[PDB]
Design a protein around this ligand. Structure first.
Ligand code: HEM
Ligand SMILES: OC(Cn1cncn1)(Cn1cncn1)c1ccc(F)cc1F
Length: 450
C-alpha cells in the first residue's frame, strides 16, 4: 500500500498546525502511531516522513533525477540568486558551483582562518570590557558575521563590514526567509530584496576591486593560502568551458556566506551553553585546552586538530540541536521503501533533530553527555544513526570548516574568559529556517588575565 496518513484537521491545510507547533515532536508522535513511514498533508503538500535510521539508505543514495533538491529548496532563489545552486540550470551545474566554494576551504586556508579567528575575537573583547553580560547568540552570529566574511571573501571585505553596515543588510536578507516561503515561494518581501540588491552591488564591487589586484598582484594566484573563494571564482570555468557570470559569482558568494554563518553560530551557541553549564565538562575541556595550548599564547590549526573532547561537545550539541531539523527531497519517480510505494510528487522528509533523539541509538537522549559519543559510541550503532551534516551525495561540504570555526572560537573565548550561564538551557525555537535555541540566552563573563 501507500504509507499511512496523518488524518487531517481540514482538507488542503491538513496538519500544518501540530507540525508548525513543534515540527519535530509532530514527527515523533506520529512515528509511534503509524510507524517508520507515514504521509501528512501539510498546506497542500504530500509530505512522507522517513523515521528510522534503518531505512534512510535509499533517500541518500538516490540520484537527483530520482530525488530532487532543486525542486524543493528552489524557493531560496530570491536570496541566493537566479540560476544558482538549487535554482541552477541543472543537477550538475549546482555541484560545479558547490565545489567552487569548497575550494576556498583547503588545509592551506584553514591555517589562515585560525589567525583570523584570533584577530577578530581580539577586536571583540575590546567591545565587551573586563566583565559584563551578553546574549551568546548575538555574539556567535556577530563574531561569525565577521570571521566567515573574511574567511571566504578575504580581508578586503572588512572595511565594508565596518564602515558600510554589511552585517545589518545581511539580517534584512536573513530576516526575510520564513520557512513558510517553502509553501509560498512568492510571499512578498520588499525590504529583503532591497538588501539583497545593495549586497549585490557591493559583492560586485568587491570583484571589480579584486580584479585590479590580480593585475597589480598576480603572484597571489600561485599561493594556496590567499586563494580565497572570490579568487577561485574570478579564475574558473565550468567543466564544459562555459564562463561564469558576475551574477553567478555574486550569488554563489551569498550561497556560501549563508551556509557559513547561521548553522555554525547556532552550534557555537548551543555548545558553549552546555559547556559553561556542566562543570564536569567545562572541566575536561579546560584540561584539554591547557594540555594543548601549553606555553603557547595563541591558537594554530594543529592545536585545533587536537581538540578532540571539545569536538564531542559540538558533535553533542548537533545531536541535541541540529540547526537543519529537516532534510527534504521531492520525488519524481515513485519510490519503493519498505513495503510501501511513496508516490511521485510527494516530498520525502528526514530529520536529524529526530534521529538524534531516537531511543535505540541514544539512552537519556535529553542529557547532554559527550561521553555517549567518545566512550559509548552510540552513533556508530546504525549507519545513519546521526546525520547533522546530511550524508551521501549531498553531505555537507563545510563539515571541517565548521568544526574548525567553532572549536576555534570557543577555545580562544574560554582562554579570555570565565563565563557562566543564566537560568536554564532554553528550548529550541522553531521560528526560522535555521533552528537555534530561543532568546534570550544571556551569560556572565569576566576575564582571566588582569
Ligand atoms: C553547524 C554547521 C553545519 C551543519 C549542521 C550543516 C548541515 C548540512 C546538511 C544537513 C546538509 C545536507 C543537505 C541535504 O542533503 O539536503 C548540508 C549541505 C551543504 N552544506 Fe552544510 N552544514 C553546516 C555548515 C556549513 C558551512 C559552514 C558551509 C559553507 C561555508 C556549508 C555548505 C553546504 C553546502 C554547499 C551543501 C550542499 C550539499 C549539496 O550539494 O546538496 N555548510 N549541510
Ligand atoms: O542546506 C542549506 C540550506 N538549507 C537546507 N535546508 C534548509 N536550509 C543550509 N546549510 C547546510 N550547511 C550550510 N548551510 C544550504 C546549502 C547550500 C548553500 F549554499 C546554502 C544553504 F543554506
Amino acid at each position: 500500500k501507500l504509507p499511512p496518513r496523518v488524518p487531517n484537521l481540514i482538507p488542503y491545510v491538513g496538519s500544518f498546525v501540530s507540525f508548525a507547533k513543534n515540527p519535530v515532536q509532530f514527527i515523533i508522535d506520529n512515528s509511534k502511531k503509524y510507524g517508520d513511514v507515514f504521509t501528512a498533508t501539510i498546506l497542500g503538500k504530500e509530505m512522507t516522513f522517513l523515521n528510522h535510521p534503518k531505512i534512510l539508505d535509499t533517500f541518500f543514495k538516490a540520484t537527483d533525477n530520482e530525488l530532487s533538491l532543486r525542486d524543493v529548496y528552489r524557493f531560496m532563489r530570491p536570496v541566493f540568486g537566479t540560476g544558482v545552486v538549487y535554482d541552477a540550470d541543472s543537477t550538475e551545474r549546482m555541484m560545479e558551483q558547490v565545489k567552487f566554494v569548497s575550494s576556498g576551504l583547503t588545509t592551506a586556508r584553514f591555517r589562515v582562518f585560525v589567525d583570523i579567528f584570533e584577530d577578530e575575537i581580539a577586536h571583540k573583547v575590546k567591545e565587551l570590557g573586563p566583565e559584563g553580560t551578553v546574549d551568546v547568540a548575538e555574539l556567535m552570529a556577530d563574531l561569525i558575521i565577521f570571521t566567515a566574511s573574511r574567511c571566504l571573501l578575504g580581508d578586503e571585505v572588512r572595511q565594508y563590514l565596518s564602515e558600510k553596515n554589511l552585517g545589518k543588510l545581511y539580517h534584512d536578507i536573513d530576516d526575510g526567509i520564513s520557512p513558510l516561503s517553502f509553501f509560498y515561494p512568492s510571499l512578498p518581501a520588499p525590504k529583503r530584496d532591497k538588501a539583497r540588491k545593495a549586497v549585490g552591488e557591493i559583492f560586485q564591487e568587491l570583484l571589480d576591486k579584486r580584479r585590479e589586484e590580480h593585475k597589480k598582484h598576480p603572484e597571489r594566484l600561485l599561493d594556496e593560502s590567499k586563494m580565497d573563494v572570490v579568487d577561485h571564482l574570478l579564475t574558473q570555468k565550468y567543466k564544459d568551458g562555459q564562463e561564469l557570470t558576475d551574477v553567478h559569482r555574486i550569488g554563489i558568494l551569498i550561497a556560501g556566506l549563508f551556509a557559513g554563518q547561521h548553522t555554525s553560530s547556532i552550534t557555537s551557541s548551543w555548545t558553549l551553553m552546555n559547556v559553561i553549564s556542566n562543570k564536569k565538562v567545562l572541566e575536561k575541556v579546560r584540561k584539554e585546552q591547557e594540555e594543548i595550548m601549553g606555553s603557547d599564547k595563541v591558537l594554530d590549526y594543529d592545536k585545533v586538530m587536537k581538540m578532540d573532547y571539545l569536538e564531542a561537545c559540538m558533535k553533542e550539541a548537533l545531536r541535541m540541536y541540529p540547526p537543519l531539523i529537516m532534510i527534504m527531497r521531492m520525488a519524481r519517480k515513485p519510490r519503493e521503501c519498505e513495503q510501501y510505494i511513496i508516490p511521485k510528487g510527494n516530498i520525502l522528509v528526514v530529520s536529524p533533530s529526530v534521529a538524534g533523539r531516537c531511543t535505540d541509538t541514544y539512552t537519556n537522549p535529553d542529557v547532554f553527555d559527550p561521553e555517549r559519543l567518545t566512550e559509548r559510541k552510540e552513533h556508530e550503532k546504525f549507519k545513519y544513526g546521526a546525520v547533522p551534516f546530511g550524508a551521501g551525495r549531498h553531505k555537507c561540504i563545510g563539515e571541517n570548516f565548521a568544526l574548525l570555526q567553532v572549536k576555534s572560537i570557543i577555545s580562544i573565548l574560554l582562554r579570555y574568559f570565565d563565563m557562566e550561564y543564566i537560568g536554564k538551557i532554553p528550548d529550541p525555537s522553531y521560528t526560522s529556517l535555521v533552528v537555534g535555541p530561543s532568546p534570550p540566552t544571556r551569560m556572565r563573563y569576566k576575564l582571566r588575565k588582569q
